[PDB]
Enzyme design. Sequence first.
Site, PDB file in Angstrom:
ATOM      1  N   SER A  60       0.794  -1.231   0.000  1.00 33.20           N
ATOM      2  CA  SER A  60       0.000   0.000   0.000  1.00 33.20           C
ATOM      3  C   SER A  60       0.823   1.276   0.000  1.00 33.20           C
ATOM      4  CB  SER A  60      -0.947   0.035   1.193  1.00 33.20           C
ATOM      5  OG  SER A  60      -2.047  -0.826   0.973  1.00 33.20           O
ATOM      6  N   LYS A  63       0.394   3.551  -2.872  1.00 31.67           N
ATOM      7  CA  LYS A  63      -0.607   4.607  -2.917  1.00 31.67           C
ATOM      8  C   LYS A  63       0.012   5.994  -2.809  1.00 31.67           C
ATOM      9  CE  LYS A  63      -4.333   1.732  -0.985  1.00 31.67           C
ATOM     10  NZ  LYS A  63      -3.627   0.429  -0.920  1.00 31.67           N
ATOM     11  N   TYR A 146     -10.992   2.169   4.301  1.00 30.85           N
ATOM     12  CA  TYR A 146      -9.769   1.979   3.545  1.00 30.85           C
ATOM     13  C   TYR A 146     -10.005   0.945   2.440  1.00 30.85           C
ATOM     14  CZ  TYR A 146      -4.802   1.256   2.888  1.00 30.85           C
ATOM     15  OH  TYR A 146      -3.534   1.226   2.346  1.00 30.85           O
TER      16      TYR A 146
END
Length: 355
Positions: A60, A63, A146
């Site tokens: 992640s 991101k 999320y």
Amino acid sequence: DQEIKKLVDQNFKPLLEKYDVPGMAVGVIQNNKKYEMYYGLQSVQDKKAVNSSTIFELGSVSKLFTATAGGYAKNKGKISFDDTPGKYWKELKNTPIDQVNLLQLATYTSGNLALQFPDEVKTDQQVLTFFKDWKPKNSIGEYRQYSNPSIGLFGKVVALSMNKPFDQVLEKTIFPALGLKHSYVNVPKTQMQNYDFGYNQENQPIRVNPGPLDALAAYGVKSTLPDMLSFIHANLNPQKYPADIQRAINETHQGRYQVNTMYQALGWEEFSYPATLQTLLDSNSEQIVMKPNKVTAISKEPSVKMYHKTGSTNGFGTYVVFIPKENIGLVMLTNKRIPNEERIKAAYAVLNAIK
């Protein structure tokens, strides 16, 4: 004297033995000087040491690059964060998801997008069908959940606005503007000797599932320690960079709403600095990561801030953190996941001692 080395050896090195992690790379930047420490092996079988060329899956933390790409497009006028996806992805016009704006997708507030796509969504065509079939649940904008699908849609829109596939947005525009020379969406043949499998919780080699191509914006970036330190440097000291990428980086530092003691920026999580260790740990709680949480509009953004992000794949762990006022930051990369709380605690011990 050698404060950084001693602190990293004291706080990060024991985690390799504790969790049987094959290899770890820790970088600290202080006053524009980069310290790199490496422990262990890129490949257990081959006995190749983890080094400054080793390529890790960021999970992640990918991101943060999608966020930077969105900031790049927005500040050139290629998108408005008030736009909806159907303006760019025309096969989403006249669908319910076309009521969600790009900022709400980038910051997880559509009101009906969970952590992962359904297991059956394996191809980009199935991704499009999923978004066409989407219907609202919670009031749009009100709840943070999320979500990889949410970011994936934002990244697809950003790519469409830049007239390039997402992999090329990063590899041809964003990574070069940041001076990152060994960061990849698709690792090329000439780098495969530097990109090994990670290790699962049974120490079995494992590589991230490609997933549908749109998921690369959520978890598909691979990078090295020197590149991640350069990325932190750009976040701390942007004046050394092209103006368009300065604006992209700045865009990722602006808090967009609050949940408890966390502020959600684009990609980055933001905190008032100084932050207690407990505040930083709370950002990784099951409640925050797995559940919808009602957001609050920001009254006054904190005047002094710090930022962090965790990321994992089945075989890798990542943690990045920086503190503008102290001109310091830290990156941890491992080829086995370890608990996020251990990453956060170890980084806190290092950075709080070098203030």
